[PDB]
Ligand binder design. Structure first.
Ligand SMILES: Nc1ncnc2c1ncn2[C@@H]1O[C@H](COP(=O)(O)O)[C@@H](O)[C@H]1O
Ligand SMILES: Nc1ncnc2c1ncn2[C@@H]1O[C@H](COP(=O)(O)O)[C@@H](O)[C@H]1O
Ligand SMILES: Nc1ncnc2c1ncn2[C@@H]1O[C@H](COP(=O)(O)O)[C@@H](O)[C@H]1O
Ligand SMILES: Nc1ncnc2c1ncn2[C@@H]1O[C@H](COP(=O)(O)O)[C@@H](O)[C@H]1O
Ligand SMILES: [Mg+2]
Ligand SMILES: [Mg+2]
Ligand SMILES: [Mg+2]
Ligand SMILES: [Mg+2]
Lengths: 323, 327, 326, 319
């Protein structure tokens, strides 16, 4: 039987005996992702270029993507606190639309590299609100371990949605002919060991010696096995998704312009660590699992090394040698 | 004033006082690219997965998409009545157009790079180079053995976050964005020029153990600049269209170099290196094998390989300085 | 606040305190309608005409009425919500396999008007949903319920745009399909038909065989006795298109009986009853002449029924002329 | 071999040894029609209804055709049902063609999702004079090309030129018009008649008699069926594909018909005549009427030749 995101989510909610609040949240998010995909693919650009007679386009797509997610989540009546990469402060849902869930997300990562048209994505993580206080940014300060659901959408050669929950990781492809997400990979598990590593080696001068030794082992394997291949798109969704599909390791460690790391814990590192862990992979800061970090600030950064367990374990052995 | 690919090509055809054959070729290619884009974005995949009770999902779906793209380009170019010899990355021998449909042009192309690209969910592309047949001989694979200097038009389609067509001719390089609401390529960047010097390098650093020593030294200088300027950033998608387009838009350098195990590189001259070298030179960039300009190599086999280092001129010239140091 | 069909259906399910089964049925139906709409607008026709050569053509080669039936049948079976399915395209009712069985009975016309799709006339999909009542193993007999028993009914119109009209206990709601994102957007809530309209709709070419009551009533519309302005005429020849015009603009639609066709032409289970249910939930009427369409107890799943529907004042006036020819 | 509108039009231009100007005009019109089709199918309607938190179709449709034709560099005078006066193209964008069009026929009933369409007629300017409104006052016989796009269950463009009538289906997967029916010819005689029978009280007696002949046939044949969508593009397109007859005759609110000669009657009459059909006002061929007003109305009776001749026979009796 063919399965769709809507049917899958509804059936998991029935199995969970949920009220349908998280189901409506996930439905609303899926609708936003379909609308972001349409805009990313430049539907209607002819009108902006004067087909009917009439600034920073990359920023403006980021703003529109933020507005789509915010409006769809607000109107789900399922959320109370929304944290977005695009917004300095957490957004507090108005009382009349308040639900029980906290959503942290990056609606799009264009600002940087959408001019070259290769890959942008949406990343989200969903928490149950934990405290009984009036809603505030503190409700988003939960460790990744508390996530009830997380995932991402890749707007690449096709549009794919990856959704991780307690049941595991499932991959859906957007069929643009009918605007439906079709289930194409069920209960996805990452390979135990890969053959690709992914990181910005332009930071080589600023890497700590554990990263430098680990990367040297991939290029010059001390057992003269074949060296790993390298890939680095520079868009987290693209690099993490390749890691999930083929196995291997993705690294964004701390460097000098970023000694707490570069990627953001709440809506980049934690969702991807959750997907990885649910797929049987790993995600570490070097010192602890990403999901165990207790955040103190909604936009705080984190180092992240994630992917196949044998590869991350091998990095951690090198990291322990240097500690 | 709004501009579409169709109108742009038609107007360039009128300015050159062409008969319309090349205009028909380019129209046919544009239609093929729109059809590849629709297939790459997975239109109709629900039917493959049984929404109407019929399930396929049979073989290597990535290979099947490459083959479909090849069939789209082949068929559209054959039915243009503008071509006589078609060389495709997907085909062992050159395809000879049937006598009733032969026109004046030779087209070399890679219709899609899905099977050679682990980042194919991130992006795939189509690359093409168009030549005029030079002799009246009965058409054969020899007609595609021209140096890239002889190109009349070349370019690529990037199937990325959006679909873009980059078309280079004597008038320069122009970039068109596909509006999927109406199926028109809209002119969005006119007479594009690459920046003189970039800040990004692009190559597979997993080959590092077997790098040619000039590549090792050059990349070492990108990471550890001897003058203590800021290091270059690295990017490598593994799809030539994506990596070359980034180089065009942002500047920098792209390398698929030779080494002792692959003394002629890995990428293919006719339908990868030459089209991208032509776009680069028309944009004010450079494209070298290390020993000569890519566009000056006279090919002897339709699938022959070439090393290629291309991008912003100051960066390519710096690489050649290091190359000469090791020569 | 923007509302999608998915959010609307889910919210109405939470309100009614349902288990989710009907919600999944409507979700599955909405997905089939989007697929039908994509095919009706001829997505992929270029492959049929050889864009990639002769060999690059499975579902692509099926006629639209065949494909549409497969889409609705498959999506409904896979909803796990149905047990008996009746379609214009199959002589016998389909009994869903036990492992996919749910509580509901769906009667549908997957692509009405496709007889004339060659001229690009609007076509549609019509559906009525019942809950199974009987104790027994599911059989064709569970579809033999009167329209009064419907829990939901409606239609999709593939016109200049694609719209889904969904009628339930809570009224009639209209959703426009946004093709950029594959979402049905709520555009008209709790729709009510006008009390009286100014358009009549029937095939006048068959006037020679008209029932005498239909003859007189149509003459009143063309030559009003009170010297009021005559009604306009409209007949698309596609029931979903004519009924939707009637709903949106008011007026009257007729597919009546004559003595060549004593029970009319349109099918009761999956043409007349869904449209009668939409009309009543909108404040309109639908009659066979002798009784309400929704009160007819069917004895055959493909049985025909005469239908006269539209604004209440218009249908009342027809009933008067019809009662006069008692 | 598959063919597209773009490739078809370009090849016909190569055959006629055109300079490319009329080809650019038809390319530009094709683009406008795809954009109108997108808007008619309601792409983007979710944004209007607040999906991201906060023009009418015939105005947008007019803007699309107007701007695409102006930027074609192929036109000098533009008449639209939407504009009271003819639009004169500025000198820098001026070509030799005059285009009369209805950007979105049937649109005022678009709330019921009725099929709508775009109708166009293209003439060549004769004079050396500066362009003006008078240059669109030409008889339908002077047309170099005409046709329509129907935004029905699918979108199709019907293009008529000297070479005949050709039908193209818009494939929304790729945004290409695909040639699906070549050198189309209408049936010699049909079985459907199309007119608003609500005006029966005002019908000219020839119309009344002709319609009676369709319902009560004089010759041992079955009655014609009736269809009247109420959008001319839909009714005429059905008339083309199934054969038959379409009538909008003189009634009392419209004593010289309701349909507009320059951008409704003329293009449909040209399509009909190129397809082997006919189109008459009753007194003469539609294409032979010399217009004196760019928005003048005409009665029209068109369709299969045997049915039009049959109407003309009844009409001449009463005349
Ligand atoms: N659609 C769904 N998919 C997966 N899990 C769900 C779903 N709906 C509810 N749940 C689970 O049930 C809990 C309560 O759901 P709710 O009543 O919707 O807030 C959630 O926090 C999840 O753990
Ligand atoms: N659409 C066009 N754009 C640019 N150059 C063209 C075009 N059409 C023709 N030309 C030039 O004119 C030559 C002859 O054109 P053709 O007669 O169409 O083969 C070509 O090889 C080009 O040098
Ligand atoms: N999504 C919905 N919209 C409207 N009514 C519903 C919905 N879901 C359930 N109901 C009502 O609740 C009943 C229980 O259906 P079920 O969904 O099978 O539990 C249905 O037969 C309807 O009367
Ligand atoms: N694309 C075309 N299709 C059919 N006929 C054309 C075409 N282009 C030009 N012609 C004919 O040649 C004439 C001159 O065209 P042009 O030089 O483009 O104005 C036109 O008015 C038509 O009679
Ligand atoms: Mg962002
Ligand atoms: Mg290839
Ligand atoms: Mg039917
Ligand atoms: Mg009009």
């Amino acid at each position: 039987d063919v399965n769709t995101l809507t049917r899958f989510v509804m059936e998991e909610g029935r199995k969970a005996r949920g009220t349908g609040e998280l189901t409506q949240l996930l439905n609303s998010l899926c609708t936003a992702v379909k609308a972001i995909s349409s805009a990313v693919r430049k539907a209607g650009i002819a009108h902006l270029y004067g087909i009917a007679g009439s600034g920073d386009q990359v920023k403006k797509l980021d703003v529109l993507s933020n507005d789509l997610v915010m409006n769809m989540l607000k109107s789900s009546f399922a959320t109370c606190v929304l944290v977005s990469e695009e917004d300095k402060h957490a957004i507090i849902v108005e009382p009349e639309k308040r639900g029980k869930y906290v959503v942290c997300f990056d609606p799009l990562d264009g600002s940087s590299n959408i001019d070259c048209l290769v890959s942008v994505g949406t990343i989200f993580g969903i928490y149950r609100k934990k405290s009984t206080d009036e809603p505030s940014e503190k409700d988003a300060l939960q460790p990744g371990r508390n996530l009830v659901a997380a995932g991402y959408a890749l707007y690449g050669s096709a549009t794919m949605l990856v959704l991780a929950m307690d049941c595991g990781v499932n991959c859906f492809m957007l069929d643009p002919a009918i605007g439906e997400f079709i289930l194409v990979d069920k209960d996805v598990k990452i390979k135990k060991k890969g053959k690709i590593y992914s990181l910005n080696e332009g930071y080589a001068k600023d890497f700590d010696p554990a990263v430098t030794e680990y990367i040297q082992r991939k290029k010059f394997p001390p057992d003269n096995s074949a060296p790993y291949g390298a890939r680095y798109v520079g868009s987290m969704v693209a690099d993490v998704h390749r890691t999930l599909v083929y196995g291997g390791i993705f690294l964004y460690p701390a460097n000098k312009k970023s000694p707490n790391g570069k990627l953001r814990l709440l809506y980049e590192c934690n969702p991807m660590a959750y997907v990885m862990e649910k797929a049987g992979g790993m995600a570490t800061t070097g010192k602890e699992a990403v999901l165990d970090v207790i955040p103190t600030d909604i936009h705080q950064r984190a180092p992240v090394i994630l992917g196949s367990p044998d590869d991350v374990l091998e990095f951690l052995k090198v990291y322990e040698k240097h500690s």
